[PDB]
mmCIF file of all heavy atoms in Angstrom:
data_model
loop_
_atom_site.group_PDB
_atom_site.id
_atom_site.type_symbol
_atom_site.label_atom_id
_atom_site.label_comp_id
_atom_site.label_asym_id
_atom_site.label_seq_id
_atom_site.Cartn_x
_atom_site.Cartn_y
_atom_site.Cartn_z
ATOM 1 N N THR A 9 154.261 58.080 -116.974
ATOM 2 C CA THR A 9 153.169 57.811 -116.061
ATOM 3 C C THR A 9 153.260 58.715 -114.885
ATOM 4 O O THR A 9 154.348 58.977 -114.359
ATOM 5 C CB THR A 9 153.228 56.344 -115.633
ATOM 6 O OG1 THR A 9 154.449 56.080 -114.924
ATOM 7 C CG2 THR A 9 153.159 55.442 -116.869
ATOM 8 N N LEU A 10 152.120 59.210 -114.435
ATOM 9 C CA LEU A 10 151.985 60.089 -113.273
ATOM 10 C C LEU A 10 151.174 59.445 -112.151
ATOM 11 O O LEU A 10 150.259 58.715 -112.445
ATOM 12 C CB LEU A 10 151.353 61.420 -113.672
ATOM 13 C CG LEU A 10 152.239 62.544 -114.277
ATOM 14 C CD1 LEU A 10 152.811 62.194 -115.601
ATOM 15 C CD2 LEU A 10 151.336 63.822 -114.300
ATOM 16 N N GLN A 11 151.591 59.687 -110.935
ATOM 17 C CA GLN A 11 150.895 59.180 -109.751
ATOM 18 C C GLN A 11 149.613 60.046 -109.468
ATOM 19 O O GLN A 11 149.299 60.945 -110.196
ATOM 20 C CB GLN A 11 151.832 59.075 -108.554
ATOM 21 C CG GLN A 11 152.836 57.970 -108.650
ATOM 22 C CD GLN A 11 152.238 56.570 -108.598
ATOM 23 O OE1 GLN A 11 151.158 56.399 -108.060
ATOM 24 N NE2 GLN A 11 152.935 55.656 -109.158
ATOM 25 N N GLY A 12 148.985 59.789 -108.392
ATOM 26 C CA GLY A 12 147.842 60.547 -107.896
ATOM 27 C C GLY A 12 146.950 59.754 -107.090
ATOM 28 O O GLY A 12 146.831 58.546 -107.170
ATOM 29 N N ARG A 13 146.075 60.396 -106.275
ATOM 30 C CA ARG A 13 145.170 59.789 -105.324
ATOM 31 C C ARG A 13 143.711 60.088 -105.823
ATOM 32 O O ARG A 13 143.435 61.215 -106.235
ATOM 33 C CB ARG A 13 145.360 60.275 -103.936
ATOM 34 C CG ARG A 13 144.398 59.757 -102.898
ATOM 35 C CD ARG A 13 144.704 59.989 -101.387
ATOM 36 N NE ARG A 13 145.973 59.418 -100.848
ATOM 37 C CZ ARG A 13 147.212 59.857 -101.052
ATOM 38 N NH1 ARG A 13 147.428 60.965 -101.711
ATOM 39 N NH2 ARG A 13 148.224 59.210 -100.485
ATOM 40 N N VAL A 14 142.850 59.081 -105.698
ATOM 41 C CA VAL A 14 141.463 59.197 -106.200
ATOM 42 C C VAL A 14 140.693 60.077 -105.258
ATOM 43 O O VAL A 14 140.757 60.011 -104.013
ATOM 44 C CB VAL A 14 140.870 57.767 -106.267
ATOM 45 C CG1 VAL A 14 139.361 57.850 -106.413
ATOM 46 C CG2 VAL A 14 141.472 56.997 -107.385
ATOM 47 N N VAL A 15 139.869 60.948 -105.820
ATOM 48 C CA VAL A 15 138.978 61.896 -105.076
ATOM 49 C C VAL A 15 137.545 61.407 -105.109
ATOM 50 O O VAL A 15 136.933 61.161 -104.054
ATOM 51 C CB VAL A 15 139.128 63.297 -105.659
ATOM 52 C CG1 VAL A 15 138.005 64.201 -105.016
ATOM 53 C CG2 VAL A 15 140.514 63.857 -105.359
ATOM 54 N N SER A 16 136.992 61.250 -106.317
ATOM 55 C CA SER A 16 135.610 60.802 -106.472
ATOM 56 C C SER A 16 135.470 59.599 -107.363
ATOM 57 O O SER A 16 136.174 59.481 -108.378
ATOM 58 C CB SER A 16 134.805 62.021 -107.095
ATOM 59 O OG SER A 16 133.434 61.661 -107.358
ATOM 60 N N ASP A 17 134.571 58.718 -107.000
ATOM 61 C CA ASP A 17 134.482 57.413 -107.700
ATOM 62 C C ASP A 17 133.082 57.215 -108.395
ATOM 63 O O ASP A 17 133.045 56.527 -109.448
ATOM 64 C CB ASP A 17 134.698 56.260 -106.806
ATOM 65 C CG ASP A 17 134.882 54.980 -107.493
ATOM 66 O OD1 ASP A 17 135.349 54.986 -108.621
ATOM 67 O OD2 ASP A 17 134.476 53.934 -106.933
ATOM 68 N N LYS A 18 132.029 57.785 -107.809
ATOM 69 C CA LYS A 18 130.722 57.555 -108.384
ATOM 70 C C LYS A 18 130.499 58.370 -109.677
ATOM 71 O O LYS A 18 129.945 59.469 -109.728
ATOM 72 C CB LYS A 18 129.596 57.868 -107.400
ATOM 73 C CG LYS A 18 128.175 57.417 -107.811
ATOM 74 C CD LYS A 18 128.072 56.006 -108.174
ATOM 75 C CE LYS A 18 126.655 55.529 -108.417
ATOM 76 N NZ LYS A 18 126.514 54.230 -109.019
ATOM 77 N N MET A 19 131.097 57.860 -110.745
ATOM 78 C CA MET A 19 131.171 58.626 -112.067
ATOM 79 C C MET A 19 130.968 57.636 -113.258
ATOM 80 O O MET A 19 130.979 58.051 -114.348
ATOM 81 C CB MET A 19 132.505 59.342 -112.131
ATOM 82 C CG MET A 19 132.725 60.302 -113.325
ATOM 83 S SD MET A 19 134.317 61.153 -113.224
ATOM 84 C CE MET A 19 134.265 62.025 -114.803
ATOM 85 N N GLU A 20 130.604 56.399 -112.976
ATOM 86 C CA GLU A 20 130.208 55.435 -114.004
ATOM 87 C C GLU A 20 131.298 55.081 -115.063
ATOM 88 O O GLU A 20 131.195 55.765 -116.182
ATOM 89 C CB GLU A 20 128.868 55.827 -114.652
ATOM 90 C CG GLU A 20 128.252 54.737 -115.432
ATOM 91 C CD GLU A 20 126.756 54.972 -115.673
ATOM 92 O OE1 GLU A 20 126.021 55.152 -114.729
ATOM 93 O OE2 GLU A 20 126.364 55.011 -116.899
ATOM 94 N N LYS A 21 132.245 54.324 -114.676
ATOM 95 C CA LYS A 21 133.388 53.893 -115.577
ATOM 96 C C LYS A 21 134.346 55.014 -115.915
ATOM 97 O O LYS A 21 134.954 55.039 -116.933
ATOM 98 C CB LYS A 21 132.869 53.277 -116.882
ATOM 99 C CG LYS A 21 131.946 52.122 -116.792
ATOM 100 C CD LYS A 21 131.375 51.713 -118.139
ATOM 101 C CE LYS A 21 132.544 51.352 -119.044
ATOM 102 N NZ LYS A 21 131.974 50.882 -120.341
ATOM 103 N N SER A 22 134.442 55.957 -114.980
ATOM 104 C CA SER A 22 135.372 57.056 -115.002
ATOM 105 C C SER A 22 135.614 57.522 -113.617
ATOM 106 O O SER A 22 134.817 57.208 -112.672
ATOM 107 C CB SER A 22 134.900 58.209 -115.936
ATOM 108 O OG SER A 22 133.567 58.478 -115.783
ATOM 109 N N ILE A 23 136.696 58.241 -113.336
ATOM 110 C CA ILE A 23 137.116 58.485 -112.016
ATOM 111 C C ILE A 23 137.841 59.850 -111.940
ATOM 112 O O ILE A 23 138.443 60.307 -112.995
ATOM 113 C CB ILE A 23 138.036 57.350 -111.478
ATOM 114 C CG1 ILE A 23 137.971 57.218 -109.954
ATOM 115 C CG2 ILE A 23 139.477 57.463 -111.926
ATOM 116 C CD1 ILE A 23 138.430 55.892 -109.408
ATOM 117 N N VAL A 24 137.822 60.479 -110.815
ATOM 118 C CA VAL A 24 138.498 61.820 -110.544
ATOM 119 C C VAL A 24 139.659 61.568 -109.669
ATOM 120 O O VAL A 24 139.532 61.116 -108.531
ATOM 121 C CB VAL A 24 137.509 62.791 -110.025
ATOM 122 C CG1 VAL A 24 138.209 64.147 -109.818
ATOM 123 C CG2 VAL A 24 136.260 62.941 -110.861
ATOM 124 N N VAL A 25 140.834 61.882 -110.203
ATOM 125 C CA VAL A 25 142.100 61.672 -109.456
ATOM 126 C C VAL A 25 142.849 63.017 -109.374
ATOM 127 O O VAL A 25 143.003 63.704 -110.383
ATOM 128 C CB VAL A 25 143.005 60.570 -110.109
ATOM 129 C CG1 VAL A 25 144.284 60.404 -109.313
ATOM 130 C CG2 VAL A 25 142.187 59.329 -110.254
ATOM 131 N N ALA A 26 143.336 63.369 -108.142
ATOM 132 C CA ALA A 26 144.122 64.567 -107.959
ATOM 133 C C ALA A 26 145.583 64.264 -107.916
ATOM 134 O O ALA A 26 145.997 63.291 -107.259
ATOM 135 C CB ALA A 26 143.685 65.269 -106.679
ATOM 136 N N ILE A 27 146.383 64.987 -108.637
ATOM 137 C CA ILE A 27 147.855 64.855 -108.709
ATOM 138 C C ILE A 27 148.450 65.999 -107.974
ATOM 139 O O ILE A 27 148.203 67.161 -108.198
ATOM 140 C CB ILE A 27 148.343 64.813 -110.130
ATOM 141 C CG1 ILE A 27 147.640 63.690 -110.939
ATOM 142 C CG2 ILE A 27 149.825 64.591 -110.203
ATOM 143 C CD1 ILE A 27 148.076 63.545 -112.380
ATOM 144 N N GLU A 28 149.336 65.610 -107.021
ATOM 145 C CA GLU A 28 150.023 66.649 -106.165
ATOM 146 C C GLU A 28 151.384 66.860 -106.781
ATOM 147 O O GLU A 28 152.212 65.928 -106.927
ATOM 148 C CB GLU A 28 150.165 66.167 -104.744
ATOM 149 C CG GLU A 28 148.896 65.519 -104.176
ATOM 150 C CD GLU A 28 147.672 66.386 -104.337
ATOM 151 O OE1 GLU A 28 147.720 67.622 -103.942
ATOM 152 O OE2 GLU A 28 146.706 65.906 -104.919
ATOM 153 N N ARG A 29 151.727 68.172 -107.050
ATOM 154 C CA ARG A 29 153.017 68.559 -107.585
ATOM 155 C C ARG A 29 153.661 69.453 -106.542
ATOM 156 O O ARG A 29 153.036 70.243 -105.932
ATOM 157 C CB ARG A 29 152.799 69.271 -108.950
ATOM 158 C CG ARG A 29 151.856 70.452 -108.913
ATOM 159 C CD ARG A 29 151.568 70.860 -110.378
ATOM 160 N NE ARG A 29 150.679 72.001 -110.416
ATOM 161 C CZ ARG A 29 151.089 73.298 -110.268
ATOM 162 N NH1 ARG A 29 152.294 73.562 -110.056
ATOM 163 N NH2 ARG A 29 150.216 74.262 -110.317
ATOM 164 N N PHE A 30 155.012 69.203 -106.406
ATOM 165 C CA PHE A 30 155.795 69.938 -105.382
ATOM 166 C C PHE A 30 156.595 70.991 -106.102
ATOM 167 O O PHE A 30 157.779 70.775 -106.495
ATOM 168 C CB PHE A 30 156.661 68.902 -104.629
ATOM 169 C CG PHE A 30 157.197 69.422 -103.360
ATOM 170 C CD1 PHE A 30 156.436 69.576 -102.211
ATOM 171 C CD2 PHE A 30 158.540 69.820 -103.222
ATOM 172 C CE1 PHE A 30 156.903 70.009 -101.028
ATOM 173 C CE2 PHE A 30 159.044 70.279 -102.056
ATOM 174 C CZ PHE A 30 158.207 70.377 -100.886
ATOM 175 N N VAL A 31 156.024 72.184 -106.280
ATOM 176 C CA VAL A 31 156.626 73.236 -107.063
ATOM 177 C C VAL A 31 157.081 74.337 -106.206
ATOM 178 O O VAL A 31 156.641 74.562 -105.084
ATOM 179 C CB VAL A 31 155.643 73.720 -108.133
ATOM 180 C CG1 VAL A 31 154.537 74.585 -107.516
ATOM 181 C CG2 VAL A 31 156.328 74.455 -109.296
ATOM 182 N N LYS A 32 158.109 75.055 -106.641
ATOM 183 C CA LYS A 32 158.658 76.222 -105.868
ATOM 184 C C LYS A 32 157.928 77.521 -106.308
ATOM 185 O O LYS A 32 157.507 77.675 -107.503
ATOM 186 C CB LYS A 32 160.183 76.352 -106.184
ATOM 187 C CG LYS A 32 160.885 77.251 -105.197
ATOM 188 C CD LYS A 32 162.389 77.191 -105.421
ATOM 189 C CE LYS A 32 162.855 77.882 -106.708
ATOM 190 N NZ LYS A 32 162.613 79.316 -106.647
ATOM 191 N N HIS A 33 157.782 78.425 -105.392
ATOM 192 C CA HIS A 33 157.190 79.733 -105.703
ATOM 193 C C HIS A 33 158.039 80.568 -106.581
ATOM 194 O O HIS A 33 159.250 80.540 -106.445
ATOM 195 C CB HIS A 33 156.899 80.454 -104.405
ATOM 196 C CG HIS A 33 155.785 81.507 -104.532
ATOM 197 N ND1 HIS A 33 156.001 82.783 -104.893
ATOM 198 C CD2 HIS A 33 154.390 81.366 -104.403
ATOM 199 C CE1 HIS A 33 154.878 83.493 -104.938
ATOM 200 N NE2 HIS A 33 153.897 82.608 -104.655
ATOM 201 N N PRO A 34 157.461 81.204 -107.632
ATOM 202 C CA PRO A 34 158.288 81.993 -108.524
ATOM 203 C C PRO A 34 159.048 83.147 -107.898
ATOM 204 O O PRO A 34 160.134 83.522 -108.308
ATOM 205 C CB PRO A 34 157.264 82.533 -109.585
ATOM 206 C CG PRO A 34 156.175 81.514 -109.476
ATOM 207 C CD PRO A 34 156.035 81.110 -108.035
ATOM 208 N N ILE A 35 158.504 83.728 -106.824
ATOM 209 C CA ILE A 35 159.051 84.938 -106.210
ATOM 210 C C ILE A 35 159.593 84.662 -104.795
ATOM 211 O O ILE A 35 160.816 84.813 -104.548
ATOM 212 C CB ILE A 35 157.978 86.068 -106.155
ATOM 213 C CG1 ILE A 35 157.552 86.526 -107.552
ATOM 214 C CG2 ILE A 35 158.525 87.250 -105.323
ATOM 215 C CD1 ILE A 35 156.335 85.885 -108.051
ATOM 216 N N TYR A 36 158.742 84.196 -103.922
ATOM 217 C CA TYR A 36 159.201 83.967 -102.513
ATOM 218 C C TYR A 36 160.087 82.740 -102.346
ATOM 219 O O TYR A 36 160.806 82.638 -101.370
ATOM 220 C CB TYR A 36 157.988 83.848 -101.614
ATOM 221 C CG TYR A 36 157.013 84.979 -101.708
ATOM 222 C CD1 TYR A 36 155.639 84.744 -101.887
ATOM 223 C CD2 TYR A 36 157.488 86.337 -101.702
ATOM 224 C CE1 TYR A 36 154.743 85.824 -101.969
ATOM 225 C CE2 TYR A 36 156.592 87.379 -101.792
ATOM 226 C CZ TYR A 36 155.241 87.142 -101.928
ATOM 227 O OH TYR A 36 154.390 88.175 -102.054
ATOM 228 N N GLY A 37 160.034 81.838 -103.336
ATOM 229 C CA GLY A 37 160.968 80.670 -103.283
ATOM 230 C C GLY A 37 160.497 79.526 -102.348
ATOM 231 O O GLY A 37 161.246 78.565 -102.215
ATOM 232 N N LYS A 38 159.284 79.630 -101.755
ATOM 233 C CA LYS A 38 158.764 78.563 -100.937
ATOM 234 C C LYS A 38 158.260 77.431 -101.790
ATOM 235 O O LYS A 38 157.804 77.620 -102.932
ATOM 236 C CB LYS A 38 157.691 79.099 -99.983
ATOM 237 C CG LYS A 38 157.271 78.127 -98.871
ATOM 238 C CD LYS A 38 156.029 78.564 -98.200
ATOM 239 C CE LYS A 38 155.561 77.610 -97.079
ATOM 240 N NZ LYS A 38 156.594 77.587 -96.026
ATOM 241 N N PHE A 39 158.345 76.244 -101.293
ATOM 242 C CA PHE A 39 157.820 75.017 -101.941
ATOM 243 C C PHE A 39 156.430 74.773 -101.533
ATOM 244 O O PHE A 39 156.155 74.230 -100.461
ATOM 245 C CB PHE A 39 158.690 73.816 -101.642
ATOM 246 C CG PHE A 39 160.075 73.793 -102.378
ATOM 247 C CD1 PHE A 39 161.192 74.170 -101.733
ATOM 248 C CD2 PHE A 39 160.122 73.472 -103.715
ATOM 249 C CE1 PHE A 39 162.375 74.172 -102.390
ATOM 250 C CE2 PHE A 39 161.297 73.489 -104.433
ATOM 251 C CZ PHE A 39 162.423 73.804 -103.760
#
């Protein structure tokens, strides 16, 4: 199971949820 916060709701028995992932940069190494 994955978390996430709802973005848009007016979609008639369906919903848009954005999932935030905390990933590191491949080169610069920043998160």
Side-chain angles (χ1 to χ4, degrees):
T9 64
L10 274 67
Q11 288 292 335
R13 178 169 298 76
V14 166
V15 170
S16 175
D17 192 32
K18 190 54 174 169
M19 184 177 177
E20 196 161 301
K21 303 172 61 178
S22 42
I23 208 164
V24 182
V25 182
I27 302 180
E28 316 308 307
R29 54 194 182 81
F30 197 76
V31 75
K32 196 171 73 67
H33 203 268
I35 295 96
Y36 307 132
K38 191 190 180 67
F39 284 103

